[PDB]
Amino acid sequence: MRTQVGIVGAGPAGLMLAHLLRREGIDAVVIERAAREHVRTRLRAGVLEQGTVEMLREAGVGGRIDAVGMEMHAIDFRFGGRSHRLDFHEASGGRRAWVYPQHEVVTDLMSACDAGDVPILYEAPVERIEGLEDDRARIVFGQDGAAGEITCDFVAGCDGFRGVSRGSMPAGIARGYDRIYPFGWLGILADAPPASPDVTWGCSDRGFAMMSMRSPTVTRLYLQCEPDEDPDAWSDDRIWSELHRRLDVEGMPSLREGPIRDKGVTAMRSFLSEPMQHGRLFLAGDAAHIVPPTGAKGLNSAMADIKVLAAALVDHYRHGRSDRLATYSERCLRRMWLVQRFSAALCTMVHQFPGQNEFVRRLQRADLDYMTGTHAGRLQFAENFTGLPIE
Amino acid sequence: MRTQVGIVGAGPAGLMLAHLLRREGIDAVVIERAAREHVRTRLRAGVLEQGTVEMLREAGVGGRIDAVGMEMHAIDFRFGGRSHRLDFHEASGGRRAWVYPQHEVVTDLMSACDAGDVPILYEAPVERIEGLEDDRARIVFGQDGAAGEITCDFVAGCDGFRGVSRGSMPAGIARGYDRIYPFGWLGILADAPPASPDVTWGCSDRGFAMMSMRSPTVTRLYLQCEPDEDPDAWSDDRIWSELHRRLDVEGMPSLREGPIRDKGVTAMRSFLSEPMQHGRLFLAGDAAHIVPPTGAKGLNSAMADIKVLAAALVDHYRHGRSDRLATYSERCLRRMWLVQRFSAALCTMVHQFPGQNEFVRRLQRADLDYMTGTHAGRLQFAENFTGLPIE
Ligand SMILES: Cc1cc2nc3c(=O)[nH]c(=O)nc-3n(C[C@H](O)[C@H](O)[C@H](O)COP(=O)(O)OP(=O)(O)OC[C@H]3O[C@@H](n4cnc5c(N)ncnc54)[C@H](O)[C@@H]3O)c2cc1C
Ligand SMILES: Cc1cc2nc3c(=O)[nH]c(=O)nc-3n(C[C@H](O)[C@H](O)[C@H](O)COP(=O)(O)OP(=O)(O)OC[C@H]3O[C@@H](n4cnc5c(N)ncnc54)[C@H](O)[C@@H]3O)c2cc1C
Ligand SMILES: [Ca+2]
Ligand SMILES: [Ca+2]
């Protein structure tokens, strides 16, 4: 059970890496703790940066984006009882974002991995990653009750925030930067058409809310809630009540209601670990970093990490240039710290912080006024939201 | 004992107002608790926004700015061991700031008020402001141990953060927004030439420092220190030691030392009160709001308030219309919240916060990288630093 690149985790980062390597003739094996069906149908991300769309297209997995996706040009910020449509397409000088949800991406990537005969082991939790400075690393997993081992030149830690790979970094080398925000998000899908054509952010003093969309007939909505909230405490009526209160404004169509499903609570957390590599182990995606999702940056950052990592592995195996592996972490971190900055700035501006200093609270409205109401503020939002360059 | 506008405080705001009113034939009396030369020589502001410079020139009190002022085009941000010269003249579309210190402004304004026979009462602490909704307001003061009272149509509260006018606002009307930062500034003047032509900000992990200037032979320096710090704990050697450590970088000239004077510790605080008027009382300047001084905004904001207040009083007395007095507070507050935002943003970025969450601390460097290293970041800094528009 030997390969060139062992990939822990068959989420979007791991599948994209396997596919990119396969296209370049580099052998990989993916090892995934969950059932394949469970992985595919996780509902998380909705929105892709333009750089991500280009990357999916260029890797041959973007064919359904035009028909299934929805191109986005503006965010409608609701606050002070008014709509503030920020055209980030214009402000960024023509760059866009797309609704194209994570489960579609993962479906596309699993399809591409299967057609390339990429071996993926499911229901195969990795328990240990060994030999990071040995001549080859060892991935120790269990499957069907029995212990297995993958030996490989490099291990890609693509196993998300609660994976094993980040804790496989030697702790004398790793440094964590971690901030948990004092709220979560209650998220739902609703069989109800979007009330307006733009993704809409309710920056209310009851709390944050969002109306995003999946199709002309399905909306994806979020409500700021208590940290560790019990979804059972939110009847459908309570959910629509807070959504209306936080989003609706005079002169814009009222939010449309419909049957709710996929109700769940997620955390709001900024986390980054340095370095993103050590010896034969390279961390990518949520294993290396997470952000609060207001700015639609996590899957996009994972894809940026994998773009760098795949290219670096190709340079090492095909072109006799191992220096790009050596600078993987340095390059991914420069981008990731700016993404962290932007995701934090959105998070601290649009959510209500319980018991917050009143001056700091009133600056939230100043920040919203400035961001939506000035050329410079709109520019910064637009260039960041549609996706920073990748090195 | 009867006048048209009674002005509490002969700082820059009060003297500017008295002078602007004098030029329009509106009678004012200024009542000041301290001695004249004490007020004149307070060591505070050094830097003026372009708008403030234009205001002084238009008022006939700007003739010395060219002679003893110093036009500024850039801030040199020192961090990560490197110099980062942000040309805000270029990034603001040609606007500037000037070194022209507060004591020179006040000297100019005192001279102009004296030449105009504006009565100014020194060593005359105002005790109470009464009759805000009576047919005329009453300013009760003491001077030479005798009680006095000035009756007026309007009271301009220009008596600074620790004055009496803010507390004369009915407390059921007023709302404060207050945030103290966990550090102060130790400030000095040094008879030492500036080591480089630009005001230089030391954004170091030891704490903030600044090298500003007054002349080719006099520098104005600040060090972040503990809140409520004792200047006695800072020998000259300790002062220069920390200034060198926080400012000097390789490849730029080293800070020059010279004899030190006017050592003092000042607070770092964001405060705003709403509204800025009630009945016949109008607050202006530090009486109404303070900011942490990193961005050189307090005197400039005081002058913005006075520009609006004087024009409103002139419209009321001289063009017969009183709608502009009615909107004084609404207009000054819109500008002032954006000033608060900017001053707060600089303050939280360039000072070390003891025991801060490490993720938030590391965002300080991201904020510095983005501000200095992107067009959008430079634009926003430059437009704000050189001074926002006044309504
Ligand atoms: C509510 C919400 C909304 C979001 N919206 C957006 C958005 O609009 N845009 C965007 O760009 N991002 C968004 N994100 C972030 C995005 O979903 C994540 O950043 C993304 O899932 C990261 O992918 P990944 O492959 O790095 O990790 P994951 O998707 O978490 O995949 C990791 C995989 O590793 C597997 N694994 C775990 N432990 C082991 C183990 N021991 N052995 C083997 N396998 C293991 C897991 O089963 C999982 O399949 C959102 C997130 C949330 C919560
Ligand atoms: C270290 C430092 C650096 C600064 N740098 C800058 C800068 O570069 N640029 C900038 O724009 N701003 C700067 N500022 C801010 C600026 O100094 C203040 O905002 C400015 O002094 C405000 O002027 P004012 O007239 O509103 O109040 P003040 O200057 O405080 O004057 C109010 C007057 O009222 C008097 N008074 C008080 N109580 C009474 C009473 N009961 N009766 C009568 N009179 C009374 C006081 O004696 C005083 O003379 C700085 C401040 C500090 C501390
Ligand atoms: Ca109801
Ligand atoms: Ca009366």
Author numbering:
A (entry chain B), B (entry chain A): 1 to 391
Sentences from the paper on this structure:
Para-hydroxybenzoate hydroxylase (PHBH) is a group A flavoprotein monooxygenase that hydroxylates p-hydroxybenzoate to protocatechuate (PCA). Among proteins in this clade, Xylophilus ampelinus PobA (XaPobA) preferred PCA as a substrate and is the first known natural PCA 5-hydroxylase (PCAH). The overall structure of XaPobA comprised a homodimer, with each unit binding an oxidized form of FAD in its active site. The XaPobA monomer consisted of FAD-(amino acids 1–73, 88–198, and 267–391)- and substrate (amino acids 74–87 and 199–266)- binding domains.
To understand the substrate recognition mechanism of XaPobA, we determined the PCA-bound structure (XaPobA + PCA) at a resolution of 1.65 Å by growing crystals under imidazole-free conditions and soaking them with PCA. The β-sheets 14 to 16 in the substrate binding domain were located significantly closer to the catalytic center in XaPobA + PCA compared with XaPobA + imidazole, indicating that bound PCA induced XaPobA to adopt a closed conformation. The PCA molecule in the active site was adjacent to the isoalloxazine ring of FAD with the aromatic C5 atom to be hydroxylated facing the ring. The carboxy group of PCA in the XaPobA + PCA structure hydrogen-bonded with the side chain hydroxy groups of Ser212 and Tyr222. The side chain of Arg214 had two alternative conformations, one of which formed a salt bridge with the carboxy group of PCA. In addition to PCA in the active site, we also identified the electron density of an apparently catalytically inert second PCA molecule located near the ribityl moiety of FAD at ∼6 Å from the isoalloxazine ring. The Corey-Pauling-Koltun (CPK) model of the XaPobA + PCA structure showed that the side chains of eight amino acid residues formed a hydrophobic cavity with the aromatic ring of PCA. This was buried with the 3-hydroxy group of PCA enclosed by the Met72, Ile75, Val199, and Trp201 residues and faced the bottom of the cavity. The carbonyl group in the main chain of Thr294 formed a hydrogen bond with the 4-hydroxyl group of PCA and was the only hydrophilic interaction in the cavity. The side chains of Val47 and Ala296 formed a cavity wall parallel to the aromatic ring of PCA, and it was sandwiched between another cavity wall formed by Met210 at the opposite plane of the aromatic ring.
